[PDB]
């Protein structure tokens, strides 16, 4: 059965967008270190307390590896929160020969547990 997915809700203000990284599964480690270090350099200009690191699914483990790096080697105070994430998925329900993407699309919700990780200055 053919089914496709969509990304998640990101309700963000003017100040939340420049201090939050969303870690993918294809995100490299040292790339994430450089981006969160640039966020720690720019958070004084943004003027907020923490830098947020959010992950869901396969990235979560290596997302936690980010919290395993800056807590010990750079003495940063981190906060770990476990959240739920709703994801809408378009699925095909059987009811000529048409193209595979041109079928009946029905929305179905699917919940995934994820990790938010706040890093202080």
């Amino acid at each position: 059965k053919r089914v496709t997915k969509h990304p998640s809700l990101k309700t963000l203000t003017h100040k939340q967008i420049h201090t939050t990284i969303f870690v993918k599964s294809t995100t490299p480690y040292v790339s994430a270190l450089k981006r969160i270090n640039k966020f720690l350099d720019s958070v004084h200009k943004q003027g907020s307390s923490y830098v947020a690191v959010l992950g869901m699914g396969k990235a979560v483990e290596k997302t936690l590896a980010l919290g395993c790096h800056f807590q010990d080697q750079k003495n940063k105070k981190i906060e770990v929160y476990t959240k739920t994430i709703e994801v809408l998925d378009e699925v095909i329900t059987e009811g000529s020969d048409v193209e595979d993407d041109d079928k009946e699309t029905q929305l179905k919700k699917r919940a995934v547990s994820g990790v938010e990780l706040r890093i202080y200055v």
Binding site: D72, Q73, K74, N75
Partner: protein, 146 residues
């Protein structure tokens, strides 16, 4: 119109030559044992007079003539023993090789000079020095907390 002169950051490191005294094996502990202190008679003019004598006795006269065109010490403080030497982009090789062969000061011997950062601007060298000292404070704080 402007001039393209390069700046060189150097740091004075004292090797702990103590044959009868034991040693502790750690990272930030040996950073403490090498980054101890500068001695009393260290100033801008003393380092300049020593490096000009090393430039004379090591590299000669006409090489010293090429090096001493813009050979100045722009910023130096004895509390941290880090200094910035202005030079040309062509004779930067000659200035770094003169910094390498620095053997001793006329008052205090037993020291090495570490050239760390070279750039054509001093503002990015200061930004690199603040980040490097921040990493030193990170290593010190990691060994101090545990």
């Amino acid at each position: 119109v402007r001039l393209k002169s390069r700046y060189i950051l150097f740091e004075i490191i004292f090797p702990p030559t103590d044959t009868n005294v034991e040693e502790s094996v750690s990272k930030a502990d040996i950073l403490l044992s090498h980054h101890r202190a500068s001695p009393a008679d260290v100033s801008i003019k003393s380092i300049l007079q020593e490096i000009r004598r090393s430039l004379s006795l090591n590299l000669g006269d006409y090489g010293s003539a090429k090096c001493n065109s813009l050979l100045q010490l722009k910023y130096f403080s004895n509390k941290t023993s880090t200094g910035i030497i202005r030079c040309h982009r062509e004779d930067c090789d000659l200035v770094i090789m003169a910094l390498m062969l620095m053997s001793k000061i006329g008052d205090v011997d037993g020291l090495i000079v570490n050239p760390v950062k070279v750039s054509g601007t001093i503002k990015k060298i200061e930004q690199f020095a603040m980040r490097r000292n921040s990493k030193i404070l990170n290593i010190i704080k990691c060994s101090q907390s545990s």
